[PDB]
Amino acid sequence: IRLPAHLRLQPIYWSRDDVAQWLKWAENEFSLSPIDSNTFEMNGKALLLLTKEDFRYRSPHSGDELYELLQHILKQRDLGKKLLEAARAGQDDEVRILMANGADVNATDNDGYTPLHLAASNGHLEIVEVLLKNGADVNASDLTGITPLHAAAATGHLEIVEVLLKHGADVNAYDNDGHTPLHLAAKYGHLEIVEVLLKHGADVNAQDKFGKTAFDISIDNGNEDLAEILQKL
Structure with a gap:
């Protein structure tokens, strides 16, 4: 059951074409028998109202399968909404139980926030560690194109940042406005994080959308110690 990203994955919001x-x-x-496109002439809000009997009457060959399939889509999408929330309040027990029942650890929200984006934003490193055990793509991106390394460097959790870089996080990955994690760390005034970014391979050449490097962002921030140290770089 590999959800196609073409589908908005929220049956309730599907159109008749969806x-x-x-x-x-x-x-x-x-590999089901050919299903006529007019078999279901309704939106997703309507499709969720029909019974399994209705699916059978409409598609004797696959109605069964289609309904059970549609029941699994609304089930796996629900577990992600619980895993995203569990990755926010630090419910490590709930985080590990949810993924043990088939929850996709790379399930993104509306803004494309993977459970790794939310876990690093709230200092839940343990959760991070257990998300990386399930193969969480640390190079994922949110609506704004900010990897979890960006949100971890901006929040100030250098222990997480080191864990992300240890698994191979894209340190030079620029934001939608070209703000690499070195920019979000220079804007937030993270000094050690920046020191950890520099040793792992921080790049100031990938300046921001305004052509500002980490030295310029720090000099524009107001903290001279972050400025001085970034200007020294």
Whole structure:
């Protein structure tokens, strides 16, 4: 059950055309008998109201499968909404139980916040560690294109940042405005983090959208110690 990103993955928000895309994917993902596109002429809000009997009456060959498939889509998407919230308040027990029941550890929210983005933003390093055990892509990006290394460097959790760089995080990954983690750390005034970024391979050449390096961002921030140290770089 590999959710196609083409589908908004929120059946309730599917359109009549989106329901046809889901049937088209399901016809090939499961090698089911050909399903007429007009079998379901409704939006996702309507599709969620039909019974399994209704699916059978509409598609005798695959209705069964389509309904059970649609039941798993609304189930895996629910576990992600619980894992994202659990990765926020530090419910490490709840974080490990949720992913043990089939929750996708790379499930992103509306802003594309992976559980790793939220865990690093709230100092939940343990959760980070257990998310990386499930193969969490540390190079993921949010709506703003900021990797978890960006949010970890901006929040000030250098212990997390070192764990991200240890698994190989893209240290030179620039933001949507070109703000590499060295820029978010220079804006937030993180000195050690920047020192950890420099040893792991921080790049000032990838300046911000305004053409400002870590020295310029720190000199524009107001903290001279972060400025002086960044200007020394």
